[PDB]
């Protein structure tokens, strides 16, 4: 309810050569700040995996003769490809948030969004159902979790104030 932090955080830390926006961006922001390139990556994976299994069947077929894989496998393939692509897109947008890749558009968008939020007397980064202690635990669980995309998915859904920026 108070939305004030319990522990000290870095201020404007440098994960790369470009400036920082959010060190633990919300799922909503990471998906809304996506570029058309990210959706293109999503479609690319979605199309590449089923085409991949058909290409494999063309190279070395399971039985003796070539037969296009079942629509069963193509369906599961499309679903898994969309998942892989959403992962890559989320990672690209999150790295734009961290300052690892070029993030000028996202910087100006975040500036305007935060200015509008201040204009509307809203808290920056939102109001949470959780106590401050659970906000802290959630941030510590979710911060920099995209590094483990190869192993597990983890995303921020908690609206905590521990994004690594100045107080205002």
């Amino acid at each position: 309810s108070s939305s004030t932090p319990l522990v000290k955080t870095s201020v404007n830390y440098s994960y790369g050569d470009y400036p920082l926006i959010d060190a633990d961006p919300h799922f909503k922001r990471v998906v809304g700040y996506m570029r058309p390139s990210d959706y293109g990556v999503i479609g690319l994976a979605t199309a590449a995996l089923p085409a991949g299994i058909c290409f494999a069947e063309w190279l070395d077929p399971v039985k003796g003769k070539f037969a296009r894989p079942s629509v069963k496998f193509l369906r599961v393939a499309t679903m898994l490809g969309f998942a892989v692509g959403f992962g890559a897109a989320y990672a690209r947008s999150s790295l734009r948030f961290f300052g690892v890749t070029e993030n000028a558009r996202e910087y100006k968008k975040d500036e305007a969004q935060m200015a509008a939020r201040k204009a509307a007397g809203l808290e920056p980064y939102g109001t949470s159902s959780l106590t401050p202690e659970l906000q802290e635990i959630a941030a510590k669980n979710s911060a920099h979790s995209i590094a483990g995309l190869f192993i597990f998915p983890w995303f921020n859904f908690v609206n905590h104030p521990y994004h690594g920026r100045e107080q205002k």
Binding site: Y15, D60, K63
Partner: protein, 469 residues
């Protein structure tokens, strides 16, 4: 992606027949390829060796661990290709190499445990991941339950891994009793030189190391590797080793230990000498893995060991996969199938392979001379970097032992090549069946990497100097 894969494959395999498991393996192989292609840009997070703590402080993510994870994905891709693509479309090769229904799921869960070992920062995560690896790899040894040898190996492996896990848990709980912590970040200069702590730490190191065959506890794992199927041996002889040695290299636990030095010398001598009278192929390769594990034990005494370990583990993985693939390819020309599970056992069954397939023997020669460490191949640069580190850090007797072991191991490495380039009566003149395209390409790619990877050493060092220093 792995957990998504596991939760997807469990359902999709439950709702599928046994006629579909090969295609399932193909699907998940392409999945892993797409992941390693599209998500590998995350290396930019670790610029200037930026390190991240995740899930509280239960996991650690750096360039070392990202690299080991990419390597484990590459290994899983190759091992899944060996199960998802038939070598020959004959009844024999549909009797020898068939995937079982749950095998891919267990492989992915074991990969999960491997990565949660290397990424571990707290001992609770380490223990959970060690058990998730070891239970899954028990079941992988046991899934071919129509083999007497494999069931026997399953049970031996269960009991010995159980005892060594008891040792790991005792070490962890003693560390906690002393320091009231499960985290090695809790250690510094002051705590090391103020508390005598080497018994606990070396107990942990040995409980982890005897799980990969460090002498004098090597015979049981060598029997397990002998007695298991070939396409299971290729996995269970490599991935646990990568996982545990990577954890022990990232965690600087044995920086100048006398016990680890002694046991590493013993591993070298045993792994070089004991492989000289071996007549079987898998035991020979097991002793090869043992002596390479010794070479990698040596760099647990350094405190700056990332480049040497990563180079050597990458080249050993490539060589291991290549040699097992060559032995898998040689089954078409051996004149006597021994078992449904180990179709080739003895080295003299490779006699005359140069007259049936000469370029397969060229591949074998390249891999054998990389194992020996002959330049310009990759094992030479591996051994060179290891020697550089250990001589920069003052291990002068171990270096001479290393040279002597490199020499003694060459004999049993050359046994294979020698019998392969011998003459044979009843050669092959024609065959209308052709081996797979994909597996041929994979083997050729590994051989070309072994042969021509030295061209990029400058570039690799320049990238290392930015991401690891």
């Amino acid at each position: 992606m792995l957990i998504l894969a596991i939760i997807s494959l469990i359902t999709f395999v439950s709702m599928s027949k046994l006629s579909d498991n090969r295609a399932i393996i193909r699907l998940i192989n392409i999945y892993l390829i797409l992941v390693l292609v599209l998500d590998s840009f995350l290396y930019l997070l670790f610029l200037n060796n930026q390190t991240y703590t995740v899930m509280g402080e239960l996991l650690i993510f750096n360039s070392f661990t990202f690299y080991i994870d990419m390597l484990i994905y590459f290994i899983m891709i190759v091992i899944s290709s060996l199960y998802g693509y038939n070598l020959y479309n004959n009844n024999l090769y549909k009797t020898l190499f068939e995937p079982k229904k749950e095998l891919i799921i267990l492989f992915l869960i074991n990969i999960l445990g491997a990565l949660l070992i290397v990424h571990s920062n707290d001992f609770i995560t380490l223990f959970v991941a060690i058990e998730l690896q070891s239970y899954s790899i028990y079941l992988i040894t046991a899934i071919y339950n129509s083999s007497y040898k494999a069931s026997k190996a399953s049970m031996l492996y269960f009991f010995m891994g159980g005892i060594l896990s008891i040792l790991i848990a005792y070490s962890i709980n003693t560390y906690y009793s002393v320091l009231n912590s499960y985290t090695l970040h809790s250690l510094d200069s002051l705590i090391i030189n103020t508390l005598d702590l080497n018994l606990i730490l070396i107990a942990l190191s040995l409980g982890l190391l005897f799980k990969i065959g460090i002498a004098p506890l090597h015979k049981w794992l060598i029997s397990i590797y002998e007695n298991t199927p070939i396409l299971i041996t290729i996995y269970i002889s490599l991935i646990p080793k990568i996982s545990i040695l990577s954890y022990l290299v990232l965690s600087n636990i044995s920086i100048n230990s006398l016990v680890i030095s002694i046991l590493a010398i013993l591993t070298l001598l045993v792994g070089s000498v004991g492989g000289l009278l071996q007549i079987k192929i898998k035991r020979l390769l097991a002793f090869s893995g043992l002596t390479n594990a010794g070479y990698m034990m040596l760099l647990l005494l350094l405190n700056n060991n990332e480049f040497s370990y990563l180079y050597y583990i990458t080249q050993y993985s490539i060589s291991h996969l290549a040699i097992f693939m060559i032995i898998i390819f040689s089954i078409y020309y051996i004149n006597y199938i021994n078992n449904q599970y180990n179709p080739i056992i003895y080295v003299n069954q490779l006699k005359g392979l140069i007259h049936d397939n000469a370029y397969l023997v060229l591949s074998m020669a390249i891999v054998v001379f990389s194992f020996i460490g002959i330049p310009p191949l990759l094992g030479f640069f591996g051994k060179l970097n290891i020697l550089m580190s250990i001589l920069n850090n003052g291990y002068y007797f171990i270096s001479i032992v290393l040279i002597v072991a490199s020499l003694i191991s060459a004999l049993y490495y050359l046994y294979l090549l020698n019998v392969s380039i011998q003459d044979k009566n009843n050669i092959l003149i024609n065959s209308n069946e052709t081996v797979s395209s994909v597996l041929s390409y994979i083997l050729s790619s590994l051989i070309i990497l072994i042969t021509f990877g030295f061209i990029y050493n400058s570039l690799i060092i320049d990238i290392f100097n930015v991401y690891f220093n």
